[PDB]
Each structure stands twice: as C-alpha cells, then as structure tokens.
C-alpha cells in the first residue's frame, strides 16, 4: 500500500479481482487449477496418442497397464514425431509463459492481500461476505490515511470504476455504435452474429494492449491520435497492424483449432453421454453480454442482472403457440385413440387378439401416436403471457430493440432475441469455428473500418483529470 | 366489407369466430375435422356391428382382413337390418344437413375473410396473433371508411358486444334469477344441479331461434310479448310449444343416447385405460360457466378467468384428509420399516441372509408397504389453511355465495363449491344421462315456469337505439 | 359436563387434547399404537437376541423358521440371562404402569367425549373440522346454562389458556430469562445448546409435578415459596432434591440409553438405507420451539407459525456455500469427466474395452464422482443470503437476535440461526446422548442455580382470582 506505488488501474483491478475470487487462497488455488487443466489436457492427449497400445486394449484377463508401453519406449515413440514434438514445444512455451505470468501475479497479489488486511482491515475470512459494496465504500475512506495517487482527492471511485473498466467501456461503445464487424449475411441463413472469446481478445490486442497499440501507458492515448490531421497515415498504419495480427492468427489457426478440439471433448462429451438435453439449454451469448451492458458496470452487476432475468427468457423461448398443429394433434389423437380403444376392448374381451400378423404392432404404434399427439396437445388452462414475457425479461435487462415491444410473438422477434439468448450447442460450435473464422474476418471485414476506428478514438476520448484518458460515453 | 349486407350479429359473430379459430384456413380445417369425426364414429359403429366376423377373429396364423366380410356381402348384411338402416338414414339426414350448413358457412366466411384482408388489413398470418383489442381497435376505426351496416351508430364499443352476446346475456340473466330449472332434490343425495349441453341447447331452441320463438328477427322481440295484457294466452302458447319440443326430445331420446353412447364410449375409455386418474381431475361445468360469467363477457375472457383460477381451485378441492388414516400410515410405516431394517442389517452383514425360503420377497413387499405408507403420511411442515385459499380462487373467479367467506372449511362449502368445480367423470356421466333426462325436466319442471318466463321477457327487454332488443341487465 | 367437579387444569387440558387427536376414537387408537410400539420394540429385540440361531441363518434350501428355536427352549434361553431378565422386569414394570395410566386415561376421556356430545354438541364426526375458535366459542357459551367452575367468576377465554398452559408458560419464562442451563462451551466447538426431551422432562419433574415439587395442587404454589424469608433453607432443600433426581437419572442411564440406542437405530436405519439425505434436512429444534414461542400459545398455533416459516428457513440455510468447495467440485468434475469421456469413447468404439474387469467398475465410480461434484457445483441464482430471506423468516416467527438484522450473511448469524434450525442428524444424535449427558448437567450445572430458581418462583408468580397461581409474564 505504498503511496502512489503504482498506476491506479493495475492496482484497482487486482483489488477487484481479489474480491471476486473470494480471497487470496481461493484465487491462488483457482489459478493453479487453471494451469493444471492445460497441462492435463496436453499430457493426457499426448499419452493417448503416443503411449497406449490400442490393439492389445481392444482385442489382441487383461489388466489395464497391459496396454501402456514402458517410458523408455514412450519417450522414443513420442520423440520420433516431428509434428507432435513441434506442437509440444509450442505448447510448452505457451505454458511456461503462463506459469511465469502466474508467479509474477501471485507475487503482486500478496501485496493486495496485505493491502486488504492492513489498510482496509478485511480479513480473508470476512471477504466472501465482506461484499464488494463494503470494500468499495471502504477504500474510499482509506484514501485519507494510507495515501494513494500523488495528487489525489478522496476517490469518488466513480473514477475508480473508470480505472477497472477503461478498456471495457471502449468495447461497449465500439459494439454499441456498430463498429467492430459482428453481423454477417450467410447464405442459407439469416444475418448471423459471430462474436467469440478469441475475436474479442484479438480486438483488444489490436486496439488496447500490445507493442504498437492505440495506448502507450494503459491510461493515456498516444499523442498523434488526438490530432485531427494525419488521420490517413494513421489509418494506413492501423490497417497494416491489423493485417499482420490477422496473419499471425491465420498461421496459429491449426494449434488453436486443436486446442478447441480436445478441451471440449473432455468438457462436453461427458455431458452429452449423460444428458443430451443440457446442450439444448440456452446461455447469454457473448454478444449480448456486451449489448445488454450498462454504463460503468462491473462484471458481477451485469451477471446479477443476467441471471435474475434468465428464467423469464427461457419461458419466452419456450412459449409460442403453433396453433394449426394443435388441431392436427387433437384430431389425430381422437382417431388413433378410437381405433386403439376398439382394439383394446377386443384384446381384453377374448385375449386371443394375437396371431393377427400386424395386431400387437398396431397397438404399439397407435400408443406411440396417441402419446406424441397428447404431447403436442397444449395443456388446457395453461396461461399465456406474450405481453408479460416481453415485459419481465426487459424489466431484468432494461434495454430493448424498438421493434420488439409491439410484436413479441413473431418470428422476427424470436429470431433476433435468440441471438442474445442463444443455446449452448451453438455456443460450443461457435467457439470451435473461431480459430478458422477469426483470421478472415480480421483481415477482410475490419481492415476497411480502420479509418472509422481512428475517428472514433480521436473523437470519443476525454481526458478526465484524475483518471486519464477514458471513453467519452462512459462519463 | 360492404354495407349492412347481413344482420350485424350474423356478421359480427362470424368476425369474432374467425378471430377465435385463428384464421380462415384453420376454421375450415376445424369444421372439416368436425364433420369427419361424426362420419367416422357412425362408420365403424356400423362396420364393427355389421361387417366383422368376430368368431373367426377370436378363435375359429390369421391375418387381420381374414375377419372382414367382402363388401358384396357387407351391403346385404347391413341392408337386412331395419333398425340399423333406419338409424343410418336418420344419421345420414342429420349429416347432410350439417354438410349443407358447412358449405353455406364457408361461402359466408370467405366474405368475412375478405373483410379482414381488405377493410381491416389483418392478414391471416398476423391473426392468430392479432390480439383481440387490435381488431376492436380496427373495426371501430373502419366504421368510418367502409361504413358499418346501417352506420346508424358509430361503433358503440359496446354495440359489438351486444350483437355477439344478445342471447348469451339472456341465458346469463335467466340462470342468474333462478328461472330455468337447474336444482333438483334427488333421494339419497343433496340438491343436484343438472345443466348440460343438450339442455341449454333446448332452452335456446325454445326461447330464441326457432319457428315460433320469442324473437322474429334475431334482433327484435315479437310485438305481443311487449304488451302487458294477453299474458295468459301467451303463457299457454309458450307452455304448449315447450310441451311439443319436449315430446320431440323424448322421441329422439334413443338416437341421442346411442350417439352419446358411441361418441363418448370411444374417447374416454382409452384414456382411462391409459391413466384412470385423468377422469378424477375436475372441470368447470356448463353450469358455473354460466354462473361465474359477467354480462358482456366474450367466451375467451371467461375462459381466461376460468383457467387463471383453476389450480387454486384444485388445491382447495384436494385439501381435506382423514385424520385416522394418517395414523394407520405412520404406524404401519414404523412396524414395516422396523422389520425391514432388521432384515436389511442382516443381509448387509452376511449377504447370505438372502436365498432363504421367504427372503427375496419379504424385503420387496415390505419396501412397497413402506413406500405406500410414506405416500399416505402427510408432509410435516405442510401448510394448508383451507380458509385462507378460497380467497385467491375468488380473486380470479370474481363471484361467490355469501355464506362461503366465513366457513371455507366446512362440508357445506365444499359440497356446493363442488358443483361449480366437478370432476370429469360426473361430467361424462351427466352428458350421458342428458338424452334420457332432458325431455322429462323439459316437460315437467319448465312448463310451470312459462308464465314467469313470459313476465321476464316482457319486463327485462330494453330497446337500445342501435342494437335493437337486448337484455335489461346487460346494459 | 358436570358442575365444576374436578381440578380444572386437567379437565380443560383433556378437552384440548381430545380436540387435537381428532376425536375419541382416534385418540384411543393413537394411544393403543403408542403402547404397541413400546411392546414391539422390546419383544422384537428380545426375540432377536435370544431365540434366533444366527449361525444356521447365515451359513450352517432353508426356510425362515429353520432359524428360530422352539418356545420350550426360548423360555429357558431367555430366563438364564440375569441381565436380560432384569432389563425385561424393569421394562415390564414401566409398561404395566403405562397400561394402567392408559386405562383410566380412557375412563376419564369418555367423560370429555360425553361433555362434547351433550354439552358442547360437537359430534366426533364434526370434530376434525369443528375447529378451535368455535369450540372456544362453544365452551365459553356453555359456561352459562350449565354450571361449571366455582361460578364465582364467569369464563373469559384467557382463563382456559392459563389452565392449559400454566407450566408451559413457566418453562417459556425460565428459558427466556436464561435460568435452566442450555448453553455449554465445548472444546473444539462453539457454544453448544443441549436441550432435549428428557432434559425438559426432568426439569418439569423437578419443578412442577412430583412428590415434593414447588406446587402442591397443580394450581397453587406451596405456601413457603411465597415468603421472602427462609429462602436459603428452601434453596438447600431444592438443591438436595435436584441432586437426588439427578442421581436417579444417573442410575437409570443404562436403560434409557438402551432404549434410546435401540429405538433410534430402528427408527432411522430404514430411512438411512432409503434416502441418506433425509437426515440432512433440518428440524425446528426443541430449543427454538421454546425460544420462538409466545407466552399463551397453544401447541397448534406455535406449530402453524413454525411450518409456515420452514421453507424460507431452508432457503436461508442452503444459501451459503463454500466457494472453495465449489472450485474443488468444478475441477474434480472436469478431471473425472475427462477420464470418463475417454473411457466411454473407447467402450463405445470397440465394446471390448467395456466391462474391462477393471474399467466397468471405475466407469461407475467415476460416474459417482461426477454426480457428487455436479451436485456440489452451484447452479445459477439462490446466492443472495438476503436480508430479504431473513425478512420473511422473521415475518413468520417474529423473533430474532437483534444482532442478526444487519449482518444476515455472516458466519455468526448462520451459526446461531443454525442452532435454531437443528439439522436432524444432530437431533437424533442429541437425543441419543441425553441419557448419558442429562444426569451430569442436572447434578453440576443446575444445582448452583437453585437459589436463583427459588427467587424466580417467589418473585414471578401472581395469584389471579379465577385461575390460581400463574406466571407473572403470561399475564
């Protein structure tokens, strides 16, 4: 808690993260688990590929370790694979980089832990329940005693929001003003939205944190971008930068594709074998987490709003009528139940129904038919609230398309309310497709917008006295 | 969309019906299905009786069509049945009358379609979805351009209600003022209420639409009924009319009993076969639909109120349970669970406790016993205030007997709240008994009330300027 | 229905009990079942111990009665057991005492049954629904025509309350003013609360109903306890009385432990084998039934309040979960589901990786592991630990520690709301430990308080004109 011992943002963000991952110990364990998952996916995969003798395992009493080959041979069998050794070297370099960042991160988090205990006085035991609210108000009271910022008024913390959410307000305003290509017109489908984890990572790596980004400090925009002139040369430089970052993405495509493959397998294939309908449930759509966001909104406030409003949204996706069918169901149930009631009364009367070549099969098929129809027959006295569903979901979200409020029941509303609330399976598919799709969108659809991106960052970037360079809307 | 081509009722009612059966294509299909159900019931009703050789089917590998007799013989075997041929001729005449009415109805519904599309501008695609208010908001605004009927009155915004519900407000006021015999004092039972579909049909055929009814136009009462004098001769004429309509009912009794027999038997029994407890669920009744109904209330508003308030009413009807049985359940569970715990501890200890002469059956039977008892044991901590709940049922239904609010928990309240809420099975029984019961109630219990019916229709019938002759209460 | 003939407290109490056990027949059956449960536990246990030949039953087709020994030998084998015969003689003496008390209990209850039928006019059929308020209204209206009570004073509807609840108001005020040792400071745990069924029985046997209690009549305090002087000799006498009652408890310890050890094992061992999580549900804690209870509150009013407020309290107790445990669950689910997905893909591919003598078992195990973790993984929402959940639990019960309202989310609040919420396993454990714990608390922790108990009963005991000697608070 040394005074002005650092820029405000890399300190405040860490403080917030420590509050979120409830405490230093929890956070440390979480990071360690995150590192062990990567290493386990890679090592389990390379063990399955390289060391196991599938033939003996399958056909040719056999104990499990009868399959595995001895290490003195596994090392040679994995080493004589140029492709495998190359993938493992790149994987190990990424891993070592992540482990080094982890060590540096915990050495910097012990400082935030001491900050809490000694200057905020919130022990790690009282932290899962201390509440964000407690600390955010509290630090502001600490600003008097344990001084921070060389020249600082007590933190309104309004600013503090700004520190934690500087680049996220920029993403919110970029997506809000329709820069950043998301909408695509696919043949055979409507206008798809393709916004993933990797794509937003690339957008932030291009714009905010890198070698030659728009920002030099993490709290100050480079000096040329504030100048009205020379906009065209800056646009050309940004276009070339994003071209080469897209080409790096295109070259790293195979490795990230392989990664998205295995982790998912383990992550989902289990769920598929258990409950194949868990992937039919719907999730709140990375595009949609950025669309339904609200000014200077920390992650936990957005997620509280998003799950307060989740069950109304599932009831909506669930609700619409399909009425003509209903009639087909009712009448098919009538005719099938009639023929089945006759055949059932006969088989009850004499019990020699059998020996008819198709009888028994007829009773079974008719039973299936009646059950399907009765499932399609709506339950009577089942209430319907189209108006309410397109009202309570909004009450939890607070943002709406202006052409949804009237026609809540149409396919236009469902089709674009779907993208915001889209189902897990298309989420897993869309995260699989991002390695192969992100470079081409990055090269083709964003490079034309570079001159508009430059004008955004020149026009909408205010210098607020305490915080530095923040988005103009987030004020 | 033309001007006053047909009675407003014969136009407004059709418009409303087209909105309800969501669209012309739906309406047609529904009517066609309604015609095919009648013909299908009667067909087999006659194929099962006449063409199938049950002896060969039962006992004397046999393919299904080994039972059926060739048509060249089925025609002769069905033709040499005077009773069957007579029932079929009457059935075919009723059918042809219904088919002719259907053709005329769709030829008149196309006109209405065109009304929607061209003057209201609501396509059949946006209709299931139009919503009631909007049509209301459309028809009344249209009254300016495509002028409505006489156009005498601009739309009242009540006028349409009176037009659609003229005779139904009369039924509501008749049942509300205790004309129209419903209560009966059966021996061995309390005061039963017998109000069916056929009985209300007969009441409307007697009073409203017929050769010599009270009404001549469908919107104007005959001129003599407005006169105070000659009430006694009018009462005698009405009594003779209802006598002869009751005698027509008594003569048609066998056929409606059969049809009631045939159409019902097929449907419900299979369901019982499937789930015999579906007939233990309770439905609102023709009565009760007429008791809880406001005056100018379209069918969909009543049904919305009736199913909003259905689950509270089922929670009420299921709330009273025997104290004594509970005790038997608790103690049978104790003794069975004790013997089973001993036998389970033994089979766990040695595992050869099993394979004993009674071993693999006592544990199973005791498990079934404990499960049945635990199902009969009420849930401790279960909160039921019978008295409190009726409150929510009232908040939905909106009407009640005064002597219910205090004693919500007695057998008097349940017994006559039972009548409003009776379970399906007594509904199906009560619709079966109506062919044989409706003529005798119609001849004996209503003919004495004819002089009160005449005084009702003379006293409570107002002439409203735009709509004609409407009930006096429905104002 | 006699003219104020026998001590009132008892007559009214019996009347109330007859209303509770809904009717004479029900009550009689309940008591008979209570007597048969004791005899069945004892006889089944002595049959299992003494008559069954376990060796033949286990190993050495065998019919069940091949195990049992003939009675001519069972009698000799049970008789040559001094310990067993002694326990059986004490058990039979307690039983005969209970059967004799039951006899009259019913000979005195036929009088209350005749009271109902002839003076209150509530048949036993209308009694499960007659309700308390009306009866109260019936008894108080009956007071006039038919003589009852001294007649010095007419009933006033609170007299009946004092009569039924004289000693229970004393218990409420004793526990409310922190006499009666309940809080203990165990090493390795917080301050435990140990209040059981046997402990409260002993407190009432010491204070209220016995040979030398504080009360001589059941409605009048002995004359010396009202005197300010001689308090020290009275304190010494009370201390000696409670010493010797504690020593009787210590000597009866083995027998009550046996029954407690016994009955309990039998009672929940069945439930354990069925649903091991039924013992994880929580119950309302004998301490807590006495803490949350108003003064003049009959048992059914307290229990109505206690179950109206049960589900809010379970929602509170389940709302706080360890994040760490959450993280361990998430990551154990990941690693187990990964290994299982691999093994499942193999057994699907070839089917001879299936039922690897080792694999099939693990697959299940791993399946058990994934299911346990997924049960520990939180699902969305329910994380509030809200002021609001408390704000409804309080609205039910109406009493909370004052340091609860602010910090509803801390471990201090959960830990001492925990004591009120009583998860059952502990109940069953705490009812098992009471035979061995009640004598030592009774000898050591209560005997020092005897001088404060004497001062309580001298200071807080008012003589109300109609009822006698009642607690001073219950006014």
mmCIF file of N, CA and C in Angstrom, chain B residues 53-95:
data_model
loop_
_atom_site.group_PDB
_atom_site.id
_atom_site.type_symbol
_atom_site.label_atom_id
_atom_site.label_comp_id
_atom_site.label_asym_id
_atom_site.label_seq_id
_atom_site.Cartn_x
_atom_site.Cartn_y
_atom_site.Cartn_z
ATOM 1 N N UNK B 53 -66.407 -60.481 -38.671
ATOM 2 C CA UNK B 53 -66.748 -61.821 -38.201
ATOM 3 C C UNK B 53 -65.934 -62.081 -36.945
ATOM 4 N N UNK B 54 -66.533 -61.727 -35.826
ATOM 5 C CA UNK B 54 -65.907 -61.863 -34.545
ATOM 6 C C UNK B 54 -65.520 -63.281 -34.210
ATOM 7 N N UNK B 55 -66.288 -64.276 -34.626
ATOM 8 C CA UNK B 55 -65.919 -65.639 -34.260
ATOM 9 C C UNK B 55 -64.559 -66.032 -34.820
ATOM 10 N N UNK B 56 -64.322 -65.757 -36.098
ATOM 11 C CA UNK B 56 -63.033 -66.079 -36.703
ATOM 12 C C UNK B 56 -61.911 -65.245 -36.084
ATOM 13 N N UNK B 57 -62.215 -63.994 -35.761
ATOM 14 C CA UNK B 57 -61.249 -63.106 -35.148
ATOM 15 C C UNK B 57 -60.816 -63.625 -33.785
ATOM 16 N N UNK B 58 -61.751 -64.156 -33.013
ATOM 17 C CA UNK B 58 -61.426 -64.604 -31.666
ATOM 18 C C UNK B 58 -60.772 -65.969 -31.603
ATOM 19 N N UNK B 59 -61.450 -66.977 -32.105
ATOM 20 C CA UNK B 59 -60.910 -68.330 -32.052
ATOM 21 C C UNK B 59 -60.962 -69.049 -33.391
ATOM 22 N N UNK B 60 -62.165 -69.214 -33.935
ATOM 23 C CA UNK B 60 -62.396 -70.140 -35.042
ATOM 24 C C UNK B 60 -61.927 -69.608 -36.390
ATOM 25 N N UNK B 61 -51.759 -69.017 -38.630
ATOM 26 C CA UNK B 61 -51.611 -67.577 -38.495
ATOM 27 C C UNK B 61 -52.732 -66.880 -39.238
ATOM 28 N N UNK B 62 -53.501 -66.058 -38.537
ATOM 29 C CA UNK B 62 -54.604 -65.364 -39.180
ATOM 30 C C UNK B 62 -54.355 -63.873 -39.339
ATOM 31 N N UNK B 63 -54.425 -63.426 -40.588
ATOM 32 C CA UNK B 63 -54.248 -62.028 -40.949
ATOM 33 C C UNK B 63 -55.483 -61.253 -40.535
ATOM 34 N N UNK B 64 -55.332 -59.962 -40.296
ATOM 35 C CA UNK B 64 -56.473 -59.156 -39.896
ATOM 36 C C UNK B 64 -57.632 -59.227 -40.886
ATOM 37 N N UNK B 65 -57.366 -58.969 -42.176
ATOM 38 C CA UNK B 65 -58.535 -58.993 -43.075
ATOM 39 C C UNK B 65 -59.152 -60.366 -43.267
ATOM 40 N N UNK B 66 -58.694 -61.391 -42.545
ATOM 41 C CA UNK B 66 -59.399 -62.667 -42.575
ATOM 42 C C UNK B 66 -60.733 -62.564 -41.857
ATOM 43 N N UNK B 67 -60.896 -61.543 -41.016
ATOM 44 C CA UNK B 67 -62.152 -61.377 -40.296
ATOM 45 C C UNK B 67 -63.218 -60.730 -41.169
ATOM 46 N N UNK B 68 -62.880 -59.597 -41.761
ATOM 47 C CA UNK B 68 -63.817 -58.834 -42.577
ATOM 48 C C UNK B 68 -64.484 -59.617 -43.688
ATOM 49 N N UNK B 69 -65.749 -59.296 -43.918
ATOM 50 C CA UNK B 69 -66.530 -59.924 -44.970
ATOM 51 C C UNK B 69 -66.449 -59.007 -46.173
ATOM 52 N N UNK B 70 -66.547 -59.578 -47.374
ATOM 53 C CA UNK B 70 -66.463 -58.809 -48.617
ATOM 54 C C UNK B 70 -67.627 -57.842 -48.718
ATOM 55 N N UNK B 71 -67.413 -56.696 -49.355
ATOM 56 C CA UNK B 71 -68.449 -55.671 -49.442
ATOM 57 C C UNK B 71 -69.726 -56.165 -50.122
ATOM 58 N N UNK B 72 -69.593 -56.988 -51.152
ATOM 59 C CA UNK B 72 -70.762 -57.535 -51.821
ATOM 60 C C UNK B 72 -71.656 -58.252 -50.808
ATOM 61 N N UNK B 73 -71.094 -58.615 -49.655
ATOM 62 C CA UNK B 73 -71.877 -59.259 -48.607
ATOM 63 C C UNK B 73 -72.140 -58.312 -47.444
ATOM 64 N N UNK B 74 -71.231 -57.368 -47.194
ATOM 65 C CA UNK B 74 -71.476 -56.380 -46.151
ATOM 66 C C UNK B 74 -72.692 -55.529 -46.467
ATOM 67 N N UNK B 75 -72.865 -55.144 -47.734
ATOM 68 C CA UNK B 75 -74.022 -54.331 -48.102
ATOM 69 C C UNK B 75 -75.322 -55.070 -47.816
ATOM 70 N N UNK B 76 -75.390 -56.349 -48.181
ATOM 71 C CA UNK B 76 -76.595 -57.127 -47.922
ATOM 72 C C UNK B 76 -76.794 -57.367 -46.431
ATOM 73 N N UNK B 77 -75.705 -57.533 -45.678
ATOM 74 C CA UNK B 77 -75.832 -57.831 -44.254
ATOM 75 C C UNK B 77 -76.220 -56.590 -43.454
ATOM 76 N N UNK B 78 -75.834 -55.406 -43.930
ATOM 77 C CA UNK B 78 -76.255 -54.162 -43.286
ATOM 78 C C UNK B 78 -77.613 -53.698 -43.776
ATOM 79 N N UNK B 79 -78.015 -54.096 -44.987
ATOM 80 C CA UNK B 79 -79.296 -53.682 -45.537
ATOM 81 C C UNK B 79 -80.461 -54.461 -44.937
ATOM 82 N N UNK B 80 -80.259 -55.735 -44.621
ATOM 83 C CA UNK B 80 -81.292 -56.526 -43.961
ATOM 84 C C UNK B 80 -81.282 -56.305 -42.453
ATOM 85 N N UNK B 81 -81.313 -55.039 -42.047
ATOM 86 C CA UNK B 81 -81.413 -54.645 -40.647
ATOM 87 C C UNK B 81 -82.264 -53.386 -40.586
ATOM 88 N N UNK B 82 -83.564 -53.557 -40.352
ATOM 89 C CA UNK B 82 -84.465 -52.417 -40.368
ATOM 90 C C UNK B 82 -84.085 -51.361 -39.348
ATOM 91 N N UNK B 83 -83.730 -51.796 -38.143
ATOM 92 C CA UNK B 83 -83.314 -50.850 -37.118
ATOM 93 C C UNK B 83 -82.025 -50.142 -37.513
ATOM 94 N N UNK B 84 -81.039 -50.894 -38.011
ATOM 95 C CA UNK B 84 -79.770 -50.285 -38.397
ATOM 96 C C UNK B 84 -79.944 -49.359 -39.589
ATOM 97 N N UNK B 85 -80.715 -49.783 -40.590
ATOM 98 C CA UNK B 85 -80.934 -48.938 -41.760
ATOM 99 C C UNK B 85 -81.687 -47.670 -41.373
ATOM 100 N N UNK B 86 -82.637 -47.775 -40.446
ATOM 101 C CA UNK B 86 -83.366 -46.586 -40.019
ATOM 102 C C UNK B 86 -82.455 -45.619 -39.272
ATOM 103 N N UNK B 87 -81.636 -46.139 -38.357
ATOM 104 C CA UNK B 87 -80.700 -45.274 -37.646
ATOM 105 C C UNK B 87 -79.719 -44.642 -38.619
ATOM 106 N N UNK B 88 -79.290 -45.395 -39.633
ATOM 107 C CA UNK B 88 -78.358 -44.849 -40.612
ATOM 108 C C UNK B 88 -79.010 -43.790 -41.487
ATOM 109 N N UNK B 89 -80.289 -43.948 -41.815
ATOM 110 C CA UNK B 89 -80.961 -42.941 -42.625
ATOM 111 C C UNK B 89 -81.128 -41.649 -41.833
ATOM 112 N N UNK B 90 -81.536 -41.756 -40.567
ATOM 113 C CA UNK B 90 -81.640 -40.545 -39.748
ATOM 114 C C UNK B 90 -80.269 -39.909 -39.552
ATOM 115 N N UNK B 91 -79.238 -40.733 -39.344
ATOM 116 C CA UNK B 91 -77.889 -40.216 -39.171
ATOM 117 C C UNK B 91 -77.396 -39.537 -40.437
ATOM 118 N N UNK B 92 -77.688 -40.120 -41.600
ATOM 119 C CA UNK B 92 -77.273 -39.516 -42.850
ATOM 120 C C UNK B 92 -78.021 -38.237 -43.164
ATOM 121 N N UNK B 93 -79.282 -38.143 -42.747
ATOM 122 C CA UNK B 93 -80.020 -36.901 -42.951
ATOM 123 C C UNK B 93 -79.459 -35.794 -42.069
ATOM 124 N N UNK B 94 -79.183 -36.099 -40.799
ATOM 125 C CA UNK B 94 -78.517 -35.111 -39.952
ATOM 126 C C UNK B 94 -77.152 -34.736 -40.521
ATOM 127 N N UNK B 95 -76.436 -35.709 -41.044
ATOM 128 C CA UNK B 95 -75.159 -35.383 -41.603
ATOM 129 C C UNK B 95 -75.310 -34.469 -42.801
#
